[model samples]
Structures are given as C-alpha cells and as structure tokens.
Target: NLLVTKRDGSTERINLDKIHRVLDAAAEGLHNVSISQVELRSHIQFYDGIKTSDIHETIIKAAADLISRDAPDYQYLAARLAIFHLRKKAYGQFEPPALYDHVVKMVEMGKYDNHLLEDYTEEEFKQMDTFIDHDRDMTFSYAAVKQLEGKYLVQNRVTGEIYESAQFLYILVAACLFSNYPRETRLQYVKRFYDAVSTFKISLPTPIMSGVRTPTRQFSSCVLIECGDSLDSINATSSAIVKYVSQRAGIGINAGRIRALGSPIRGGEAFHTGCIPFYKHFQTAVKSCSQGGVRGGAATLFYPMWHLEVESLLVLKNNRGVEGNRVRHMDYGVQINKLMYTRLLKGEDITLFSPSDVPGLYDAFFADQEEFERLYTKYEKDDSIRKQRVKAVELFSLMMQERASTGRIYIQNVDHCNTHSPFDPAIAPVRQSNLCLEIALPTKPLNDVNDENGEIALCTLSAFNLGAINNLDELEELAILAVRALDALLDYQDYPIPAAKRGAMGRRTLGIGVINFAYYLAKHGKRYSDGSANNLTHKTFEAIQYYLLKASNELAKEQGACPWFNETTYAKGILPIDTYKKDLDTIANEPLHYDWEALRESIKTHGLRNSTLSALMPSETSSQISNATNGIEPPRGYVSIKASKDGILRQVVPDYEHLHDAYELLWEMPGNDGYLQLVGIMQKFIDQSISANTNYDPSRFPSGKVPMQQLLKDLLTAYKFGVKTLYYQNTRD
Candidate 1:
C-alpha cells in the first residue's frame, strides 16, 4: 500500500507500483512488469492527520526501493531521489550573507569561523556572495555527486552532518574568488578562474570542498626559492618563507648555499652558526606563519654535498641530535653528486665548502656526476681543502629513519632531476625544487640572486595533458602549443603580485611538464628500473628540456625581456651557456635564421620572459581532469581492491576504464602475467617522489624477500648517486 499526498494536508492509500522482469525460465531479452507488496507496518502508522509532504517523501523512497535490485547504482539513485526531494522542499540557490549566516549558525552556533572567515561583515558577504549560482549544485550527475557528496562534503561542526553537495562547492568558490581578491580587478580575474574551476577548464591543486574561501587566496599552488650563503640570501629565503606562508602557498627552499656549522663569516663578526641556526630561524618562521593560521604550507630544504655543512646535513633529521643544529620544520634531503656517494661509500674524510667556496661545483651539478666527483675530489685533495671523516652509512640511516616515521624529506635524484633538466647546459644546478619535489630549477648562477628585498622565487605553475596527447606527432604539436599557450597565459593573466608575474614572464619561464609519463612508458613497454627505460628517460627529458629552452629563446625574440632580468634575481649569470636552435627560420614564415651572435646582442638589448621554463609540478588536479596519471607518477599499484562499507562485498575499484579492462584480465589469468607488476615497475622510472600507494599484499610476495630497509636501499640503488626526494610505505599493516 502507498500513501498518496492530497496536497490538502490529507493522505489516501494507493497501490504499490513496480517494474521487474519475471523470467519464464526462458527469459532472454524478454521482461515482465512487477509489483511490490506494501504493509502498513504500525497498522495505522499513517493517520487522518498525516502531512502530505511526509507521505510524498515515503512515495519517492518507495519508487527508489522498487529498483533497488539493480544495486550497483544504488548510492547514486538514492542521492538523486533525496536531492530531488531537497529541491522540492528547500528554497532557491543560496544568496548569502544568508547562506553565510546559515552556515555560521549551523556550524558555529552564530560564532566565528576558523580564521574568523565566517565573521565577514554583511556588506562584504553580499557583494561577494551574489556571484554564486545556486543552480550549479543541481548539475551533479549521480555518480559524480556520489564522489562529491560521499567523500568531499563539508560538515556542520556542531551537528556533524555532512552537506554532501557539490553545488555548494561551486558557490563557495565563487564567493571566495570575489571575497579573496583585494581589488575589483583581482576579483574579476578570480571570477574567470572560478568559472574555469567550475567548468573544469582549470582545477584547484587539491579538492574544491577543502579549497573554498580558505584563509589564503588560491593563487600560487607551490613556491620554489633559491637561497644562498649569506645573511642577505638567508634573510631573503626567510622573507620568501614569510610571504608564501602568508599567502597560504607551499614552499621549497634551496639551501644548497648555506655554509657549514662553525664556519667563519665574511666579517669575522660571527662564527658561522650555519643553516642550523638560520634553519632554526626558518623553522620558527614556518611556525610563525601558519597558512592563514590554519595549516602550514608545504616546505622542503635541499643541500648538496658541496655545502660546507655536509656531515651536519646528513644528521639534520636525526632523532637524537642537538635541537639548535636542526631545521625540524623542513623536509630535508641532499643534492648529491657522484663524489658525495663515493665519499659515503669510501668513508673518506670529506671537505665541506659552500658552492661559493667551491665555485664550479654549483654550476656543474647536472653535467656528469662522475666528472663532478673527479673535479671536486681533485679540489678536495688540494692543500686548500678542509676535511672531516665520519661514518657515512650511519648518517644515511638517520635520514631513512626520519623518512620512515615522519614521511618527511622525500628524495629526488639530482642526477635524474637533471638528466631531463630541459636547460641542462643553461639550466641552473637544480639545488632543490618546490614543496612537492616535482619541479627542479636552475641555480641563480651569480653566487646569489640579486634582489634588494624580494625576489623571483614564487612558482607560477601549469601542466600539459599527455593522455590527451596521442602520438609523438601530437606531442610535438603540444610542445609548440604548450609554449604558445603558456606564453599567452603569462600575458593575459593577472599577476598583481609583481615579483611572481615578473618571474613568470621573464625568460618566458614556464613549467612545460608532462603527465602520463608512466602511460608513455607503458605505451612503449618499459620497466621502472630497466637500463632501457633510464635511457629513454634521459633521452626524452634531455630532448624536452633542450627544445623547450629553444622554444623560450624564440619567444624571447617575440616578447621583450622579463622586467626583472636586470637584477641578479633574474639576469643570466656565470657559466653562461647559450640556447641556439638552428631550425628557428625553418618553422617560421619569414625563414629568417636566428643569429647566435645577434641573439646575445638581443639579450643585451631586450631582456627575457621568465628565467625558467619546464618546471614539472605534480599535476594532481589537471591530471584528474585529463584523466592522466598525476605528473611523472607511475600507475599507483599492481592491483587495488577495496571492500565496501558492507564487508561482505568487495568493490572492484578501478579508477579508469583501462584499469577495468586490466581487472577483467586479472581474473581471467592467474598472476596476471606480471603485467600489473610491470606497471608498478615502470613507476620507478620518472618519479623521484614516492607519491603513489603500493598496496602489495605481503602474502602474494615470493618468500624471503629482502627486509624493508634493504628493499628501500635497493630501490635507491638505481640512482646510486643517491635518491634526492623519495618515499615508500614499503611494509603493509
């Protein structure tokens, strides 16, 4: 029995309606209509005084229940009925300060929001909130909303009730774009970004629900800075830390220049307390600027063995060490040269010196690790060398332990980081990268970046969709397209933050990075650690880096020099290698060949767009939109299976259709021909950071595999120079 709403506050009993196929036991494509028997459970649960809306709620749910046997879409079907109910019962799209007050009232009982965000004055809320479209929430497709509603919902802090609505996500972004931008111009810019975000043209680095109207304006996804050995550069680094932290942007500092502890200062005014004291200063700085006083922005500190602080560098993260000597807030790792590894292996007395002291070492990090070791060791053995010998393996374990427990100080192979460092010769020694350990940039080359107070250290990031890019032809087209599109993005964009905009357009530096690196690896049938794959990686990156530099050089001719190039922070400095592509004329209409000699004249005459190009950030959000692997990440795992909330059933959770096909094949073939294994194997190729989860069930492994630490050591063996920023959850619980 069904109770029908009479709209007059009364209800009447009706027949249950159903649709089902009854098999004749010969049922093929044939179907039969069906019905469900309904019993009034409380015998008179419904009364003459029953409300129509309550009865309507029961009817909609009953209709959903009739189709419940097709259980796969159950989560979505229920959500649709409920959302439809909400539409009928609730008022129009949110117009806030009303929504703001509603949220503030619901979550905080009319108290303030964290960061006091909800405490926006009524006028501020109204001016900003009107841009939100309430109807956008209605657009969530059942499956899409399941992801949005189930996982990404924000909740009422008091009620603990999740809002399970993606449309709220849209309005929130709109309101944020309006509210956060300082000027109306900035507001308009953010408004365009908001539309792009909603329509999926561009994406927030993380999820939308967590992103909206958060303390920091969503501008810089991450920031990378090059710090040097002095009070000036260190302070510059500190200032950058403060600035990015304030903006709620993540930071990665290149502390490769910071001198060793006990080293002397230039003035003899102070014994070098080294990076430790200042790193402490930095730690305090990190602690000081809570990202909008909410969460801390991500940060990493990098050092090369060349730093005078080598031995101390290794132990910075040690569990038992002098607190003043460590930067506990930083994610730490070394930029190793072949010499450093050899020094570690030999247990030799290592000489410590700043890159400024060892001038050539700073610029030569990417060329050949062996030659670098040879040159540096020659420098080490010289009478001028100052040395100390210590247990290298003992120091390494300190780092590994720091990594295992804290998941801090991820490692990236500086050698591997460079093998693709697009501007290899011209590319600065990649002292360190951004917070994510994805982008690697060239050193400032002038011993220090020349900035009075601020510098061009903040990152302006983007990525190319390798999955959407079909073959090599398409990739080449994309490479050119990437250069042009990125060129325009720098131009049309709002970069009211002068330094960043200057740095972005300067030298026409853009991160011409790729996603689906693993996809490409698989497209070519390569393993993660094969010599062949490494060769391909070297070839591909070298090609990408070299050509992209050439692409920027061409653009440099078209656009004037980036405004910041004259300052040491932006200008080309020592060990100047030229980017002279021979085919410039061939690709152009005029066919006028570029003159190398004249290009130098042009550099002196004009300037550059941005100093850097081709910085690879972990393309998390855009990759999701393109349906590609996140950055140079490998396929996350061999086999990923999850049991639903109901433990009796397992959900074959494949993220993509191809993975679904793979899953089908896995069931069809035992051990899966080790194909899935190879998929994980390919990951070790391009990724320096261990961003993916390897859900390897221990029972499936061959008996007597190496111990976890040994496996980790083995993993880093490929980059014997030593992993720069790497991680792994080697053992499962």
Candidate 2:
C-alpha cells in the first residue's frame, strides 16, 4: 500500500490496481491503444515523492519516442498519456489561465521567476481568465500531447523550473483564442486552434514547450487588400478585415485610390484630405483589435507618384513624422509603376489625377506608355478636368525615407497584382489593394461571380502539413484525402455571401495547399538539380489537382456545380478549363490516365461539381503545425541537422561527419538556418503563392553569399515549362 499527497495535502494509501482506473478515466474514451495500457504499468526506478502525472509523462514520452520507428496504436497511447499527464497536473480545478496565474504566483513566492509582461493590466488579465474552456482539453490525441509536452510544462523562467501542464496549456490556447475573438465565432475557433495545437498540428511557440500556459495568443496569419474606390469602399473594405481578424485572421489594408489634393469631387463636395488621414484612424483601430496578449493588427497604404496624395500616404505611418502625420503601428507600401519609373529617370514632372477622373488608370497600369501618354494628352485638353504635375524624385525620396523608418510595409508592383488576376474584367482606375494585396478579383463585375453584384473576390486558406505525412505513398494518398477533407471543411464553413457560396460550390474552391515542399523533397531524397523533386512537385500537385478536380466534377454531377464556374474560368464547366485540363490533358494524351473526351462526357453526365479547382496559400505559421517548410521549396541543403518528431528531437551530426552523407551541398553549415532561407527562396518559384515575409536569417543568404538570383532563375526554369502562378515575398536584406 502507498500514500499520496494531493495539492490539498490529503494523504491516502492506494494499490497499483486503483491507479490504472484513475489514468483510464482521465484519458477518456480516445486512448484505446496498446501503448497507453503499456505506459499504465511502466516501472519507476526510484519512487520518492513522484507525482502521479510524471508517470504518465514517462509513458507518453516512451510511446512518442517510438513514432519514427513507426507504431500502429502508438498515436492513441501517446494521446492518452499526454491527456492523463495533463489531467493529473491540472488538479482538475483551474482552467488554462488560472493555472498560469497560479504557477506565476508560486514562482514569485518560492522561486524567482520573472513575468513576461511589464505593464500587465487588469482588463488584459481578465480577458484571459474569461475565455478558457477546460472541457476541450480532452480532444488531444497521443501524438498531439507528445508534441505539447515538448513545448509545455510549468516553468520558472529564471531557474527554468518546469510548471503548468500540457492540459493547462491546451486550456490557455482555447481561452486566449476564445476571449480575443468576436462573440459570434470565438467558441468555434477556440475549439479549432486547440484541436490544431493538441493534435500535433499547428502549435503556438510558447505553449507548445512550457505548457506553462502563457497568455501569448497572437494572430497567426493575415489576408491582404487593395483599395478600389471611394472612402465608402475603405469602410466596406474593413468589413472583411473585421470579420476575418475577429476570427483570428490578421488584416492588411492598402490605401491606393484616394483622390489627389484639390481634385474635383462629385456633387460639388469639398476636395477631401489624402490617404494619411484615414491611416491616423486605422492605427488607432488596429490596437483596438488585439489578438491575445501577443501579435498586433496591420494596415498598409500604397500610393503611386501620380496621385497628388502620394507624399502624404507615404509618410502617414512613418515613425519619425510629426505626431499628426505619424500614425503609429501600421504598415505602408508605396506602389511603384512604369510611369513613375520613367518620370523619375527623365527628371520630368508626373501629372496627378483623381483615380476617378483617369477612369482606367489601375486597369491600364501595364498598358503601353505611348497609349497612356496619348490618353493623358486627351484628358489634359479638357478645362472641366483638374490637373497638377509634381516632382517624382521628391516622392521617391519620401517613400525610401519612410520604408527605412517602418520596415513594416511592402513595396510591390502595381501592375503585377493586376497582371496575375484571373478576374480583372471591369476594373475602375484606382490605387490601394485589399487587406493583403493578395486577393485580385476583377474591379469590374467580370462575371467572376453571379452578375447580380457578386464577383468572385474572396479567398480562404486550407493548409496541409507534410511532416506527419510519412512518404511518397502517403503524399500521393493525400490527394484523395485532401479532397475529402476539403469536402468536409466546405460543409462546415459559413461563406459571406450567396455569390461566395455559388462560387464556392462551383469550383468547390477550397484553396488546398502544402507547406514544406523543402521537407517533402528532402524526405524523398535530393539536392541541387531536382530533376526528381521537380518531377515530384509537378506530378504530385498535378495528380492532386487532377484527383480533386475529378472528385468535384463527379460530386457536381451528383449535386451541382456552383453557378460561378459557368464563366470564363471554368468555361461553363467544360473540359480543359480551370485545371479540369490537369486531368483531361493527360486523359486526352494518354489512355493510361483517363479519357478526356470521356471525362468531359462524365462532366456533362454529372455537370462537374465545382469550378476553379485549386489554389495554394502561404503556410508561414501554418507550416509549423506539421513542422515542414513552405510549399515546394527545394530540399533545404539536402541535409537536416535537427529532426523533431512526436516531440522527441534528435540531431543527426554523424552525417555531418559523413559530409557528403547525402550529397555535396553548395553552402557551408548546410544544415543551419542559412541553408533553410536558400531553400525558402527556391520554394517561392515553385509554390503558387507564398505568405509574405517568410522568416529568414539574411546572414545566411548574405546577398551575394548564395548565387541566389541565378539559382532563383534556374530554380524557376520549370516555371517557364508551364508551371503556373509562381509568387514569392523575397526575404532579402
């Protein structure tokens, strides 16, 4: 018989027989695996004041450590061990944050542990307290808990004494997310982010290790926007921002369309102030929409030199500007255009026009300069029109000045976003972009959506983590799995509008994407000339696109394609459009694949369930969920030094001693962060689109250090071979 002291200090004697029952109940019903049962009786060598939970951690860690060797029911055992350990540590009383506060108090009293926050206010603390849901902690699987236990634990930062528990961190994640979100959707996302964290999926940095349950729930990602019209449009624009950010999606807004100084207004209204005026308010608004105690809101403005408001918008968010001009805590992007380039080079004045007056300025942005000049001359002839010419160099000077000050905004081509648009049918002349400058639905109602005011403009991300995916067979199998998962996710999502629904149903536009192409290629084996990896990337996505397209096509045959695909993109759901060709091209060319003519017949027979089949999104933090690099990156140095799986980490340096262990890599410390950035750079060329500002250590890339530009050019050689939509955010110094 043995006696134990609970936190309440009550001592009781128990037999090992009763202990299993306690552990079983804590694991709930999900832990029906052999590993869990094995861990239940795991022996302790020197048992002295050993917490009951420590036994559970040992068992879970044991099962987790065997994951790489591959275990059938180990996942379940890992989950049970992790959950039981957490339950034991939690004392079943406090939710996530309560335990955090409790641990913090204990450290302050006993061990000298410093709190992360300095001016931690009452409201913020209250916010964390109110948002937790303890019941949700039971959702984790063994693999997830294993992942959690690695990052989480009770910890005294100074002495590094471990505290809080994995289960407590789960609660904190749920609480932090749910509290910060809007009333309507907070609970749902609270469950989701928690599921992602506990399932060995997407983990937040602090909680994943300490389980100390830090109140650092920051927004994980963002969506970009381009301003299209009037001040009314800016408000309308924030509607997307509010809906998305309120549900944990970050926002980036660019003010590119406001009229120039002294420009004429409709109905004789006064010519209003420039883009900076709105930003003064936006900086205030972003702080208003905090995500946990971590991360912040983002808004950016991009103005071309031709806009009379260009100078003001450039400096609106600049740090050193007069407080009136300086809108603290927002991003700024100055749009560079061919016209601005030409004018700056020639030392000539550029005429500023109200975007409304120019009509197709943004639309004709990449249009021929000679034609633009002819049109400008035609417009200049009118006396009813207002016009002013400004010095281009001065505006350029200000943009650089502000860029150095903020390091927050982006500098992207005005024409690139448009040129890439599949929906640019009826664009009105304009400046700014959407929240992230990512979505490029047509400015004009180009039938991208239902003619009745709905044009396809919105996009959502569905990320796939590659590490948990074991090998090529698994990768190939995921194509079918992704289709199924997307189908389920679609059933669950609540689209913003019927047009959105219609468009979604047509293509079933799930935006299914992969993170850590570099990892995929690495696992498959490679370095440098990825004749194989290239083939794999193309073939895999091709197969995935084909399978997904076929699934939707068949589903549509049974259900119905959304009305949106009947337009140009899907060509009324005909073969060879919007990636139906991915499958059909093979079908047409090879009898081995399928019959294109027959697939088309099947489509007419079934009416192809969706239109616009697939899109790839930037994984960024989403990539961390499964521990993979961003999509389609070249094998990061053909060598990996640190390998972490199921939360058990190991460094492979024997291979470093092996040197060309895999193959000869070009750079020194090929296994370090430097090589990772090179891999990230290689990825942009292959990935359809990358999340902006991919995290990198430039000392590795070091400008000339790697043959980056040439390697990039050669890396993208396949792009010219018909690879589509190569987008990147160059993470260079």
Candidate 3:
C-alpha cells in the first residue's frame, strides 16, 4: 500500500477518491475543463511514503500545462486548485478568529507591523474579519495565484510558509491603507476599498502590493532624484538611490545638470571626469540593492540631447561597446525638444553645449518652451560658448537605430512635458520622468544625503480595470475611491529619505492609470485601428480625468489643497484640456464630453488637492493579477507566454474564447499611426504621461529589417502627436 504524509503529520493509504474529489471541486464552475483529464494527465508515480502535497502539486501542474487558446479555462481550474492547496497549507479550515489570529501571529513574529493590532480592538478586528469574502479567491488565474504566492503575499522568510490567503491579504492591505480614517466610518471605507480591489476593479502596483502590509510601509512605486555637478551632490544622490531601491522603489535619475568631461571644476582647481564615471557608480548602487529577491533593482538615467556626452549616453546599453566603456546595466533616455526636431526638419546642425559653459540654460531647458527656445538661440549665436556641432538628422538616426536594436533607449519630449504640466514651470518645473517614463515631477540636487530642502519626487501608483467598468458612473466611483485611498497612503506611508518625504507631502502627486484596455475595446466591439475606438478612448479618459479632478477638488474643500497649491496651474485656473497640444484635434475630433468650465472655476476657488492626477504606467505585473492586458497597449498574442523568476506563466487575453478575433495583436497592426493617434488623444486628458511603446515587425519588410526611414517617420509622428515619452521600440523578429 502507498503511504501518504498528510498535513497533520499522519500517514494514510493513498486514496484516489480523495484526489478526484478535490479536482472535481476545483473544476466545479469552470467551463470547458475536465477533472478526469487532470487526473489522467497528472501521471504521478505514486510511491510508498510519498507526501500528499507532492500529488497536489502534480495535479495543479497538469491543469496549468493544459492552458492554451483551445482550453483557456484550464487556467481558472488550476487557480482554484492552487487556492485549495494554499488554504490547506496556510489554514486547515476557516474560522471566525482566523484573520485576527493571523495578524497577531504575524505581528509577534515580526512579519507584520504591530500597528495593525495597535490600531484596532479585538472586537473591531473580529468585525473586520467578517468583511472578507472567501469566494473571491477563485477569481484569480493560475498565473495570478502563483505570482501572489511567490512574490507578493507575506510569508515566513525562514520557513517559506505563507501566512495569509488572497482575501486575508486584500483586507489587510485595505485596513492598513485606511487605518487612520475616522473610527465611525473607517470600516465602511475599508469594505469599499476591499470590494474594489478584490473585484479586480482597481490594480495596485508591486510596491504597494508587497510593502503595504509589512513593517517598511514604503508604498510609493517610483522616486525621482537629480544629480548636481559637485561631488557632494553626486555622492548624496547615489546614497539616496541605494536607500529607496532597498525598499523596492524604482529610481529615475536626472543626470542632465552635471557638467561635461574636461570641464574645469572648483573654479579651475580641478578638471571634471564627466557623467560616465558617475553613471557607473549609480549603476552599481542600483544593482547592489536586490528588491526582496524578486528582481534586481531598476533605474533609468535621463540626459538632455544637448549634453556633450549625449552620443555616449545613447549607446551605453549597446552590446558592441567595450565593457569598460559601456554601463550596460543602466537604461538611458535622451531628453529632446522642438528645437532638435525643427533642426532636423530644416537641415540645420544642432550644437551640443556643457551646462557649465551655458549659464541659466539648464534651468530653461525644463521651463517654458518659448523661454527655452529663446535661451537656446542666444547660446547658439554666442561665439564664446564651448560647443560641438552635429547634423540633427544624423543624430536622430543614431538614436532611432540604437532604440530599434537595444529596446532600452527611451525618448522624452521635454518641451511638451513642461508645456502640459499642471504645475507652473516657474515654481515647479518637471525636470525629469520616473523609471517607466509615466511620471513627470520636479527634483533638486541634494547638498547632503539627509537634506530636507532638496526635493526627491515620489509618486504612488494604481490603475483602473477598464474591462470591468459597465458605464461612466462606475468609473467615476473608482476615481473617487482611488484618489481617496492614494491620498491616504501619502500620509500613512514611510519615506526612505527626508527629501522624498518633503517632495511627496508638498506636491501630493498620484499616478492613476488603466489596465485591460484591449479587453474594454473588445467588449464594446471596437477595433484599435478604427475611428470608433479613437472616440471611445477619448470619452473614457475624459471621464476619468474629469472625475478624478472633481474628486480632488472636493478633497481640497474638506482638507485644504496640497502644501504647494499656488505653485500649480490648477491654482491659476489652467487645466490639461486648456494646455494640450492643438494638433491632437485633427485625429481625435471628438468634442469635450464633460463640463470642465465648472470644475476649473471650482479649482480656482478652493484649489486642488493633488498637483497631478493621472499617469499611465506600464502595468506589467499588475495586469497579470487582474487577468487583463498591459497598460494602454495591444496584446502580444491571444495566448502569450511570460517567463519570470517564479516560472513560465501562460496568460490568455481576457474572454479569449469569445473575443479572440476582436483583439488587435501588436505585430499584426499595419502601423503605429493609429496607435500613436489614440495615445495622443488619451494624453490630452492625462495630467502626466504614458508608457507608449512603438511596435515593428521585421518580417513585413522586404530585407527582413525595419527601415530606418520608417523608424524616423514614427519618431517624428510621436513628437507631433504629443507623446511625452516613447518607451520601447518593440521589434518582432
């Protein structure tokens, strides 16, 4: 007889009936999935003294391996089995005291913050326990369950024992987010937040997901730090990068202000070594901090195209360069403006200058577009300034070639970013973007690592599951709840450095994005290449923007505006719709859908709570949890296979069985024109930026290569269409 080890440390004869019963229960409501097939395909080699947990794992793998276009429901079945397995391992059976007991246990074990127990009474904790809906655990796909278990959920670091289940995790996060709310209504808001998250109506970022329930409470997703020309400033910024990345925050460094190579420093006392050496230092700092062993630390270094080291910065990620010359671990972005584009169009040679030689030019680079142009012209005309000339077209070609080849180089439209920023450029210019190119915030170099006067811009992020929204009212509710929850997070979260705390509390910036966009369009019977999709996109984002602003305005009336209210365009009665690029109307000619004038007048009267409301991030992990498409982009395929440290995960597009033909695959699209137009329209409503990626298929071209001319055209179109940043030039081989 085959003896099996059970959870209770008892041995029993292996029972096929018990295994079949568990598979049957897992496949209860799932469609087009067979439990008998799972049992037959498990192919487990039963042996004496085999652990029953091993059998369970084999059965789950069998269900997961059967996932494909033909049998997508197998993913759901596998998820159900995984949940069943988790419940058995974490807790034998559900009880009234389970959640409170888990929290107490975790707090005592140092796995959770003690504030969870400090903030609530035993009675209240028991009351909150009843709010959890265990039925919601089955909604996850097999991949989502594994991601949560492996990377997100809180577990014992020493023993690898998971302490909380899916519902328990959601409730714990919600309670932590609203722990400071008024006692009378806090639980109500917690339930609301819990419903929104558990129902997959809103998606939270990785930092917020993993850190909110723990002691660190480092809930912000990304932070922006600027490096100065001085050694003190550069070293301080590197230290700040280490601190934030250790807490699992992505880093965005503005290396534009540093002086170029061979430049005189300390009043001609010493010559500078330039940005490359400092970049290597920062790269080492980033990689040194592992993000809880889930992945290596991530950072993106941004520099103006006019810098003397622009060419070298562009090729840092290329493979041909020598190891000593290349900082291959770091991602790079070239900050371009209209002057560069105009120079290319007019066949003019653009001059690259060191910030040290050109006084007030670095300040103007991120300021008003006209002011920047005026200073740029003066610098170009001055004969005394140190500079080098390169043909604009040639420089642009190099950028495009590097982008197509490495897919790491990003393009930031600096002038457009400043022009559309909700903050006044005079007071708070958006100096740089975050790691994913979605955030536009201001930063100042630190005189010291602990300096409070310096601004280390930080942003907390979340996204709407558009596929779940049935109407604008649903979206409106999500906007209000999302704004309130994130605003609460700013007050509750802990910061790595004092400058970050100052920057976050002062600006109160929130990045609210969207997921399941492709599913939303498919559900409404709109193709991405059609005009109807464009119109739908405009209306959806307009509603989101309006509702979010209205929500923040209400918060302003109740709690007062953010600390630097007057430093923003909202205080001056300027809105995103008022400052958007006018060229967008040619493609998305749809009229304004909401009453913006009233909202603007209200904002002018009471001010706004948050400086910026919306930024579309590349929701790579969150979308997987929501079973949705990535942010504002087409899917790679109906059945895309994603490989990560955890394992290979197969994700099917939402409702693939029904909407298979309705979705637009990325490489199959005729061109990026329609996609760019759609993103541009959406950008008109967003206060920040989008992680817009350009797609190309080499197979479609005659020489099995993407033409450089086509890439140049797309680059120009992205600029003209008001795309603030182009993320990846995704080429399919």
Which one wins by TM-score: 1 or 2?
1
Instruction: Per model, state how many residue pairs clash.
Output: 32, 50, 0
Residue-level lDDT of model 1, residues 1-733, one tens digit each, is 4555555556567422211221111122212212222123222345545555554445334433433222323223333444544444333322223555545543453222353354345565454455555544443323334344344445445664554244445555545434433464544544454454454433334433454434333455556666766676777567656765666677777777666666666657677656676777776666576745346665777777556566676666656766766655567755655555565667654565566556566666666666677667777677665555445555556555555555564555666555433334443345566666655544341222335333354444555544444443333434443454445544433443445544555444555466656665655555453333554554355445444444555656765556545542224421122221222112212212223344454445554455555545666435543335556655444322233331211111213324433322212222221222232222222222223322233454567342455534443443432233453333333
| TM-score-best of 1 and 3 | 3
Cα misplacement distance, residue 193 of candidate 3 (Å): 0.7
lDDT of each: 0.47, 0.45, 0.86
Q: Compared with the true structure, what per-residue lDDT tens digits does model 3 show for residues 1-733?
A: 6788986689998888998888887887888887778778774556788788888888887888899899899989989888887887677653323678888978988989999999988888888888888888889998899888887888877888877788887898899988988998899989888999999998988777877888886676688999888888988998998887777678999989888998997779989876788899998888887644337779999999999878788888888968767888778889998888999989899899999998888888888667778888898999988889999988998998889889989999988898988888888888788888999988888989999789999988889999878897787778778999999999988887999999899989998999999899899988766656888888899999999999999989988999888999989999999889899888776788788999989999998889888999998788889898988888988988877664567888899988988888887798888888889888998999999998988888898988888988888998897999989888886
Across 473-505, the per-residue lDDT of candidate 2 in tens digits comes to 443344443344345444434554344454344
Q: Residue 415: error of model 2 in Å?
A: 5.2
Cα displacement (Å) at residue 301, model 3: 1.1
Highest-scoring model, lDDT: 3
Lowest summed lDDT across 10 adjacent residues in model 3 is found at: 89-98
What is the TM-score of candidate 2?
A: 0.58
lDDT of 2: 0.45
Residue 694 shift from truth in candidate 1, angstroms = 9.1
Worst 10 residues of 2 by lDDT: 650-659
lDDT (Cα, 0-100) at 182 in candidate 1:
48
